[PDB]
Amino acid sequence: EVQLVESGGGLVQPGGSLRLSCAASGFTFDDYAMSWVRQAPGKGLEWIGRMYNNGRTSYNPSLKSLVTISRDNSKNTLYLQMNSLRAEDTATYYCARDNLGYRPSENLYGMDVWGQGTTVTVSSS
Amino acid sequence: EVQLVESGGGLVQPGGSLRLSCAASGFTFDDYAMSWVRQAPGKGLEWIGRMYNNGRTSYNPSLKSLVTISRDNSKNTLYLQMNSLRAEDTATYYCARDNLGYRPSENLYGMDVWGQGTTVTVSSS
Amino acid sequence: ASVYAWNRKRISNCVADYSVLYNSASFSTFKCYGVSPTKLNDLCFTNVYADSFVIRGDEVRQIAPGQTGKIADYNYKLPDDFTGCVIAWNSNNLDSKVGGNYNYLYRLFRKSNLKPFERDISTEIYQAGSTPCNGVEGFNCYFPLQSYGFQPTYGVGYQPYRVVVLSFELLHAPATVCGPKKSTNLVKNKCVNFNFNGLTGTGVLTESNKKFLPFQQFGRDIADTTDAVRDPQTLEILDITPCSFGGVSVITPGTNTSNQVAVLYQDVNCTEVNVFQ
Amino acid sequence: QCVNLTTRTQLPPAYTNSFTRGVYYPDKVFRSSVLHSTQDLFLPFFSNVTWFHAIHKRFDNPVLPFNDGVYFASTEKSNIIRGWIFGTTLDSKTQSLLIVNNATNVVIKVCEFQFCNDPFLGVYYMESEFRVYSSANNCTFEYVSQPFLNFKNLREFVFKNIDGYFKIYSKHTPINLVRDLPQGFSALEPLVDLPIGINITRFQTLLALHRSGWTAGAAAYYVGYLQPRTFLLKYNENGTITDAVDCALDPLSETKCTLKSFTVEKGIYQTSNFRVQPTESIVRFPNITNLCPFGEVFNATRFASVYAWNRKRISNCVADYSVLYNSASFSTFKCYGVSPTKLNDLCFTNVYA
Amino acid sequence: DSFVIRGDEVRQIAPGQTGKIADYNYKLPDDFTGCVIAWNSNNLDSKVG
Ligand SMILES: *[C@@H]1O[C@H](CO)[C@@H](O[C@@H]2O[C@H](CO)[C@@H](O)[C@H](O)[C@H]2NC(C)=O)[C@H](O)[C@H]1NC(C)=O
Ligand SMILES: *[C@@H]1O[C@H](CO)[C@@H](O)[C@H](O)[C@H]1NC(C)=O
Ligand SMILES: *[C@@H]1O[C@H](CO)[C@@H](O)[C@H](O)[C@H]1NC(C)=O
Ligand SMILES: *[C@@H]1O[C@H](CO)[C@@H](O)[C@H](O)[C@H]1NC(C)=O
Ligand SMILES: *[C@@H]1O[C@H](CO)[C@@H](O)[C@H](O)[C@H]1NC(C)=O
Ligand SMILES: *[C@@H]1O[C@H](CO)[C@@H](O)[C@H](O)[C@H]1NC(C)=O
Ligand SMILES: *[C@@H]1O[C@H](CO)[C@@H](O)[C@H](O)[C@H]1NC(C)=O
Ligand SMILES: *[C@@H]1O[C@H](CO)[C@@H](O)[C@H](O)[C@H]1NC(C)=O
Ligand SMILES: *[C@@H]1O[C@H](CO)[C@@H](O)[C@H](O)[C@H]1NC(C)=O
């Protein structure tokens, strides 16, 4: 069964670095495009970035300065090394596969399987 | 070489139970139908039952009450747990593969490969 | 479903986008008969039916008109005049288990070949020999349905393929299924191109005195050209007169004499084109 | 629940004339002021149409063949005829079609019904009795639709089954004729096309009892059989089929079929051709002499050893393999690459024993 | 004209074909004259990763 599990959220100080995981099961990244999307408490889903199968990375151009998406194909997992987390970086971070091959429904977000997402908050303590 | 070997025959008391084997070599039961046939000393070959590849069992309706055909696909062997062996249950028991494929001529029994069969006798001692 | 018990679903009263299916790379087999796959969005269809089943990998060859085999003759027959599309794709990750998936069955034995689009779910014991079965298995007496052994380790061709067959009827009844082309305003009494439910043409649309029966959509003349049509939005009848055609004759003296010519428009009045009637 | 009806009166079914009934629209295309020739499964003109009664004590629910198609006519008052049963064996072994019109709606179901021997509906003097099937396990097609329906009403239906498609054509006619089919013409409009995809060779009419034992209300129906033939249909200025010509009924209408006109001028017209159908098949082949010496091979006194196996060429003779395969002397007879019953139909080269 | 495609997409290198390769990458005309030559290059164009 295709299932995406994220881990690594929690409290994090301002100006620090925090690494997130997208340990995937049921499929491999050798033939699929994978995306990271955030979700504010008061705003909608905001696309962060995308990792292609050949290693090609694209990011949100208002968020390029502080995100990094990498793979570990031996452990078939996706990594997100975020740095300098400020107050507006408090989000629930979903990891999802891109449905490039087929479009069964007219999906606004263009993804066929989602992750449960992990919640990250930035405050004093 | 496709070869069917049976074992487990011998003397057996009246009213008891006796388990027979059809340890097969050269083929597996995942795509073939397997049958059990008996042979009286004074009568012809009498069909006992059939095991299908999906686990479906059919039996001789005059013999359903006292036979049981099961598989062990890990050991690619067929089992025949017979109970309440009486005087007319003395037979030489052949285990054979059904021919659901191409038949080169008319077969009376419809078996492409036979077993050597094991002999079971029921008497006082 | 299994192929002997193939499911049929009615598709009606909806707008079908076939451009998202044909351009999808998921389908390994996409064979259309009697209609081009890129012309699907430009047509409107009546009596759309979707037949779905699961077959073996190398048996997708038999899902075509005029084929022979266990699947075509005993499980699912297509007519020779079939119009529609046969769509198939590998489902090894869905329909195969490590011990063997036995939920998909096919009819190995039957007494006679199936008719086109006929379903047989009867499970009587087949007689493959001389001795009659009398409904009981025995020598040469078998259950007619055998299951595929679907394992992931099997090679391509012994692997499960999910097959969906679409069937249409082309422009003979009022149509309920259309492609996503948007309708324009209705312009009458002018020479225009028209597209009524996939029926293309060129003519002048006029209000008609003919009264169509409710099962009738269009009307044909002697030459089987559509001379009357029902508008699918406002149920009114329109005559389609062909746009005016007149033979042109060039009256001239010799080119040694002069280059002046006159033109005659035959059977054409002068107000629909030195003017002389 | 099933009930045997044991108060029937024995009487043979009747026969009457079809006249010019049973014509339906062959397609959904409007045609006006035209003469159109079509070849389809039609009911022949002036044919022998079978007549069944419901009167009190007649209650006609027999087993009838379906053949290529069924024309069903109904001279009906007070709503006794309610539906039809289609199938092959009419039990749970095969899959059968149910069309009913009860007091509320019209239901079409394709299921494996275990049908009663006498399926019926009932009206108490309200509908409170329904005994058609005892079970329904595997259902593939369901379709609930609008109500289709001195004798006052005439119901014509045409049931056809081509390519898994059940075509039902219907026409409703106000009549005031007492006993028989009225003589006239009425083209049947198409009612419904059902994708049932089942084998149909037998069918049943469903009636309704009247209770106050049982009483049969006054009704009468007619069963005719469709044959593949050509009609010349006339479409008037309003698009209604007003007249028809059976092309194979009589030489006058065959002349009308050939000339593509309903009026024939005085003269001689070559319309058809008389041919004499073949009756028997006569196959004459010469004398079966020079038999192969299989008696010298199988019935030899001495046979060879297996290391020194004898080989004999069999050639230039006629070999009867039917006396070897049907002989009970041979315990083993295994043929490879050729069927034993196809041996006499083939000619062989380089035969060795 | 030389390129590298997938193994089962060699069917699409023909006149009148449809697919990702024919429609978006390499279209042949319906009046094409010439020869289409293809061969497996798994030992040359495949790496273990
Ligand atoms: C109504 O009559 C029919 C005809 O006799 C009955 O059908 C038979 O029922 C017996 C009872 O077991 C069977 O042995 C026969 O095989 C049946 N006949 C056929 C042709 O199948 C029917 O059972 C009667 N209805 C009721 C309720 O008893
Ligand atoms: C298709 O099915 C899968 C699982 O059955 C589901 O996760 C996915 O959301 C479905 N896609 C659509 C567009 O509904
Ligand atoms: C339909 O049924 C009849 C009789 O029940 C049988 O002879 C015929 O072969 C059947 N048709 C098919 C396609 O099985
Ligand atoms: C929409 O179409 C239906 C029938 O197709 C018609 O009855 C109705 O008037 C139409 N409505 C509009 C706004 O065109
Ligand atoms: C109709 O058929 C019956 C018997 O099948 C026969 O006796 C009768 O004469 C026929 N009627 C006509 C008009 O041929
Ligand atoms: C008519 O048949 C339908 C279908 O089973 C049922 O729902 C309905 O109650 C029936 N009506 C009467 C009056 O029997
Ligand atoms: C038909 O019904 C029987 C009993 O309900 C069931 O065992 C069988 O699997 C069914 N067949 C199909 C094709 O659904
Ligand atoms: C055709 O319809 C018109 C009315 O539209 C009527 O006057 C005329 O009598 C009809 N003709 C026939 C042959 O029914
Ligand atoms: C061999 O002898 C038996 C004895 O009756 C006879 O019936 C048979 O026809 C003989 N075989 C041949 C091939 O003639």
Residue numbers in the entry:
A (entry chain E), B (entry chain F): 22 to 146
C (entry chain C): 348 to 620, 641 to 644
D (entry chain A): 14 to 69, 77 to 145, 153 to 176, 185 to 247, 257 to 397
E (entry chain B): 398 to 446
The authors write:
To understand the effects of these antibodies at a structural level, we next determined cryo-EM structures of the complexes formed by VH ab8 (variable domain of the bivalent fusion construct VH FC Ab8) and Fab ab1 (the antigen binding fragment of IgG ab1) with the N501Y mutant spike protein ectodomain. Cryo-EM structural analysis of the complex formed between VH ab8 and the N501Y spike protein ectodomain shows a single dominant conformation with 2 VH ab8 fragments bound to RBDs in the down conformation and weak density for the other RBD, which is flexible and primarily in the up position. The global average resolution of the map is approximately 2.8 Å, with lower local resolution in the RBD regions, but local refinement yields maps of the VH ab8–RBD interface at a resolution of approximately 3 Å. The structure has 2 receptor binding domains (RBDs) in the down position with well-resolved densities for the bound VH ab8. The third RBD is in the up position. Residue 501 of the spike protein RBD is at the periphery of the footprint of VH ab8 and shows no evidence of interactions with the antibody. The presence of the mutation thus appears not to influence interactions between the RBD and VH ab8. In cryo-EM experiments, Fab ab1 also binds the RBD in only the up position, but in contrast, the much smaller VH ab8 fragment binds the RBD in both up and down positions. ELISA analysis of IgG ab1 and VH Fc ab8 interactions with unmutated or N501Y spike ectodomains demonstrates that the N501Y mutation has no significant effect on VH Fc ab8 binding but results in a slightly higher EC50 for IgG ab1. Our results suggest that despite the higher infectivity of SARS-CoV-2 viruses carrying the N501Y mutation, the availability of the extended epitope surface on the RBD enables effective neutralization by VH ab8 and Fab ab1.
